[PDB]
Design a protein around this ligand. Sequence first.
Ligand SMILES: O=C(O[C@H]1C[C@H]2CC[C@@H](C1)N2)c1ccccc1
Ligand SMILES: O=C(O[C@H]1C[C@H]2CC[C@@H](C1)N2)c1ccccc1
Ligand SMILES: O=C(O[C@H]1C[C@H]2CC[C@@H](C1)N2)c1ccccc1
Ligand SMILES: O=C(O[C@H]1C[C@H]2CC[C@@H](C1)N2)c1ccccc1
Ligand SMILES: O=C(O[C@H]1C[C@H]2CC[C@@H](C1)N2)c1ccccc1
Ligand SMILES: [Cl-]
Ligand SMILES: [Cl-]
Ligand SMILES: [Cl-]
Ligand SMILES: [Cl-]
Ligand SMILES: [Cl-]
Ligand SMILES: [Cl-]
Lengths: 205, 205, 205, 205, 205
Amino acid sequence: QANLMRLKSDLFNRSPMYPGPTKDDPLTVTLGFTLQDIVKVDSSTNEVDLVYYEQQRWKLNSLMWDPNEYGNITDFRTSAADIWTPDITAYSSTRPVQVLSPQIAVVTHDGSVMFIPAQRLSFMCDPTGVDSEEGVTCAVKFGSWVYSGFEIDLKTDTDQVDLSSYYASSKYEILSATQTRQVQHYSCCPEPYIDVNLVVKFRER
Amino acid sequence: QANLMRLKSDLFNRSPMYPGPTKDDPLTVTLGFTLQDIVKVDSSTNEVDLVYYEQQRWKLNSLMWDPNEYGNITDFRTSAADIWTPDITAYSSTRPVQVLSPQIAVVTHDGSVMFIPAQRLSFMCDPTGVDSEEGVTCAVKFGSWVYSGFEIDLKTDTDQVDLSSYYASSKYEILSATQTRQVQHYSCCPEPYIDVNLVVKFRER
Amino acid sequence: QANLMRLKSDLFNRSPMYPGPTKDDPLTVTLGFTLQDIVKVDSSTNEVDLVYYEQQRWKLNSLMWDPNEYGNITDFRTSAADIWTPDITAYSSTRPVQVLSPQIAVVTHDGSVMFIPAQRLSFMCDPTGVDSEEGVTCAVKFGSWVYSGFEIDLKTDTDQVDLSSYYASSKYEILSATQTRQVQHYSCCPEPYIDVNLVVKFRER
Amino acid sequence: QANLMRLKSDLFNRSPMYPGPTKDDPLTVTLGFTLQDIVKVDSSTNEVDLVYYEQQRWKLNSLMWDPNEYGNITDFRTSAADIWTPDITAYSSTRPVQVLSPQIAVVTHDGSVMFIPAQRLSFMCDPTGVDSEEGVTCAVKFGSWVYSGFEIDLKTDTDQVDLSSYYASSKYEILSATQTRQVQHYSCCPEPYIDVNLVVKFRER
Amino acid sequence: QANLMRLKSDLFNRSPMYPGPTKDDPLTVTLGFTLQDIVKVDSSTNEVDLVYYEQQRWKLNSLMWDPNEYGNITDFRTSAADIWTPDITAYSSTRPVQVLSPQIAVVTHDGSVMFIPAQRLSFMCDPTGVDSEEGVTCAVKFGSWVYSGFEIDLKTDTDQVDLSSYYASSKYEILSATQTRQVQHYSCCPEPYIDVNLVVKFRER
Ligand SMILES: O=C(O[C@H]1C[C@H]2CC[C@@H](C1)N2)c1ccccc1
Ligand SMILES: O=C(O[C@H]1C[C@H]2CC[C@@H](C1)N2)c1ccccc1
Ligand SMILES: O=C(O[C@H]1C[C@H]2CC[C@@H](C1)N2)c1ccccc1
Ligand SMILES: O=C(O[C@H]1C[C@H]2CC[C@@H](C1)N2)c1ccccc1
Ligand SMILES: O=C(O[C@H]1C[C@H]2CC[C@@H](C1)N2)c1ccccc1
Ligand SMILES: [Cl-]
Ligand SMILES: [Cl-]
Ligand SMILES: [Cl-]
Ligand SMILES: [Cl-]
Ligand SMILES: [Cl-]
Ligand SMILES: [Cl-]
C-alpha cells in the first residue's frame, strides 16, 4: 500500500508535468469506438444523437518505471487531472458532449496510458430516407483542435466499429459502422491535420 | 467536541490519502437499491427515468481507530470529499445521473464506511406493452468502470429490491424488482468485471 | 471597519471549524416556510413545482463573542462557506433543487446563525381533481439525510405556513397550508429520524 | 504598463478585502435598467421571460488613489472576483438568472465602481389580455437579500426605463416601462428593506 | 522537452500577468468568422441558432522571446487560463453561448497569440419569409463589453464570411454572409465602442 503511494509521489509531485508534444517530440494516439445506441433523430433540424465509448491510448517516456524497485507494481489507476490528455474533438457537433463515465485512467510501467470516456454526442446528420429498406448514411470526424500532423498522429487498430454492445431493442438498427483514418488540408493553415471518420449506415425498426 | 476535531486531524491531515485498491490488496463493496418511483416513460426514444437511493458500504484498515483513546467515539459523519469512494457506474445510461442527496458519509471505528446517494437515472428501456395486464420488463447493470474483478468485487445482502418506500399514487405499479450479482466478459479486455443487475417488471395503473 | 475584520479572523482563521453535532452534544434547528407560488402541475407524470423561501436558525457556543471587546458589534453577515450548515433535504423530490437566493447568512453575538435560502422544488404529487371546487391535497417531508434524532432535532415556531407573500395572479389558489413536526421510522436503522411535513390544499383559478 | 500592475498589487494584494457595509459605515447603490426584449410568454404557468442589462454603481474609500503617484492613471478595468459586489436579487423569480455578459467592472480614482451585467430573467406574471389593444401590465422587484436599509440603500437616476435598445421586430411591443424606489417592511426583522419596482405594460403584435 | 518547460516558467511564473490594455497602451484584435450551420429557427419567439467558429488574434510585447536562447522554439500551445483574452461579446444574444472546442491557444516568439473558439449562439432574429425564394436577412454585432475604442480597436482581414465549411445537407441554404467593422455611439456613454456586424441572408431548402 505504501509502495503505490511513493510511486505516485515520485512521478507527479517530484517531476514537472508534461507540456504537450512538440514537432521534435511527436505523439501517436490510438483510437477506436464502441457504439451502444442511436437514441434520437430530429428531422426538423437535421441533428442525430449517439451513445458510445471511445478509446484513448498513448505512451510517454516520463511515465515509465521499474516494477522491482516499487514492489512488483505493473500498473495503477489515477485521476485524469494528474496526467496530460489529448484534445480530441468532434467537428460536426451541434451541442456540447455529455460525459457518462468517471474521469479516471490507467497507467502501465512501460509508460502507456489508457483512457475510455463514455459520451452522448449530438451532431449534423440529414435523416431523409431512414424509413426505407435501404436506410440512411451519416458521418462525423474526430481529431485534435490545436495540434497538427507534426505534433499528434492518429492510428486505428481495426477499421470495423464494435457493435457487440449495441442495444437490441433500439428504434434504429445498424447496417454498417466503420472507423477510418484521414489526413485533412484546411484553407487556414498550411499544416495538415489528421482525423478518424466515423461512418454509420442505419435504418428504422 | 475537541476529541472529534483531533480524531479527524489525525486520520486525514496527518496520514496520506488511500490510493485505491490493488490486485494485492482488493476491496469488496456491498450494494443495495431502494426504488421510489418510475417517473417518466418515452416510447419515441425508448428511455425510462427512475428515482431511487443506492446503498454502498466498504471497510478500510487506514480508517480504523481506538474509541477509548479519543473519548468513547464509536462513529462520525464526514464529507465525501475527505475519503475515497468507489467508481460504481450505470452502463445502459442515456443522460448523466442527477444527485438528489447531500455528499456526506458515516465512518465507524472498525474502519467501515457507509454512503447512501439519492439519484435520478435515465437508461435504455423499450416500454412496448406497458398498458397490458402482463406488463413490460427492463434491466440496467451497475459496477466499476476502471477497476476489474481482481481489484474490486461486489456483493448483495439480499436479491430482493426494497419497495417499502415506493410511491403509492405512481402512474406505473411494480410487479417484481430484483438485484442479482453478475461476472462479465467483454470483447475489449481479458480481465473479468463484476456488476449488479437491477431488473424491474412494471405495468400501467 | 478594522474591528469587524479582526472579529472574523479570531472566529474562523484562529479556531478550527465545527465538526457537526454529536449524540453527546446535539443541535436543534428551527424551521419555517414562506410559500410564494405553485408554478407548474404535471398530470402525465404526477409531479408539482413550488417557489418558496425556507427559514433555518441554530445556535453555536463557538460563534459567541463579547460586543464591548470588538467595538460594540452585535451582528454581521458572512458567506455560507465560512460556517457549518444543516443537511435539511426534501424526501419526495424528482429533480434537484434550484437555488434562487445568495449564499450569505447573518451571525449574532449570542452565537445564533440565520439562513434564508430561496428554492424551486419539483416533488411527487397526484393532482387529480384540482379543477373541482373542493381542490386537491399534497404533502412533502423535510429532514436531515445523515444525522439521526439523537444528533439533530427539528422544531417549528408556528404550525401555519406564511402565505402573506403568495402570488395573487397565480394559476392555483391556496385553501390551506400547514408545517408540522413528525418522527419517521425507517426499517434500515434502529435510530428514529425527525422531519417537518409541508401539507398544501390548493385549487385551480 | 508597470504602473497599472503596481496599482492593482497595492490595492488588492497588500490591503485586506472589504467585509461588506455596516450600520456605522453604510453604502448607497444606484440602479438602472435597459430593456432589450420580451422573448417568451407562458399562459399555462403564468411566467414571462425578459432580456435586459442592469446598471449598478457604488463608491468605496478603500478603492481611492492619487493619479499623479501612479503615472496619471484615472481608471482601470478589473475582474468582478477581485472586488466586493452587492447582493441585488429579483424577488418574484421562478428560475435562476442566466448571465449573458463578462464578469468585469471598471474602477475610478475617486473609488467609484461600475458594473453592468446582462441577464435573462424568468418571473411571475399573468399575461391574460396581451392580445387586447389595452395590453397587460406586470412588475418585478430588485434589492438586497441579506443587508437592510441601514447597511445598503438604493437610488435611481431616472424613473423612466431605457427602451432605446429594445428589439424592433419583437413579438410584443412596449406601451410603458418605469423604475421606481420602494421601502418594504417585513414582519421578520426590525430594519426596513429598500428595493426598485420595474413595471412594464406590453401588448402582442 | 526541458527547454519548453523553462520558457513557460520564465514567461508566466516569473513575470506578473498582463492587466489589460490602457488608453496609453491600446490593443488591436483581428476578428473572423467561419459559418458551419443554421441548425434551428423559432417563429413563435423569433430566435435563431448558429454553429460557427470565431477567429481572434492579437500581439503582446510581454509574450516575446528569443528562439536561440530556448533551443530553437518558434511557437507553443498553452491553456487559455494562462494568458489574457479579449472580452468579445454578442449583443443581441437570448441565451448563454455554448462552447464546442477546447480552451487552448497557440503563442509565437514575436508575441502573437491565436485563439479559435467553436460556439453555438442563440440570438434575436425574425424569420418571417424564410420559405420564399427571396429569403430572410438577420444580423448580430460582436465586440468588447467593458473596453471602449481608446483601449481596444477591432479589424477584419476580409469582409466575406468563410462558407467553405458550411453543412451541405442543412435545412437552410446561405445566399450571402458578410463581416463588417462598425463604430457605435451609445446613449449611456460618450466613449465610442467598436464592433463587427455579422449579416446573414438565408432561405429554406
Ligand atoms: O487554427 C485554426 O483552426 C484550428 C485548426 C484546424 C482547423 C479548425 C480547427 C481549429 N482545427 C484557424 C486559424 C485561422 C483561421 C481559421 C482557423
Ligand atoms: O478498458 C476498457 O473499458 C473499461 C472496462 C470495462 C469495459 C467498459 C468499461 C470501461 N468497463 C476498454 C479497453 C479497450 C477498448 C475498449 C474498452
Ligand atoms: O442510512 C440510511 O438512509 C439514510 C437515513 C434515513 C433513511 C433515508 C435517508 C438516508 N434518511 C440507510 C442505510 C442503509 C440502508 C438503507 C438506508
Ligand atoms: O431575513 C429574512 O429574510 C430576508 C430579509 C428580507 C425578507 C426576505 C428576504 C430575505 N429579504 C427572514 C428571517 C426570519 C424569518 C423570515 C425571513
Ligand atoms: O457602460 C455601460 O455599458 C457597457 C458599455 C457598452 C454599452 C453596453 C455594453 C456595456 N457595451 C453603461 C453605463 C451606464 C449605463 C448603461 C450602460
Ligand atoms: Cl468523475
Ligand atoms: Cl452536499
Ligand atoms: Cl451566492
Ligand atoms: Cl466572465
Ligand atoms: Cl476544455
Ligand atoms: Cl430582425
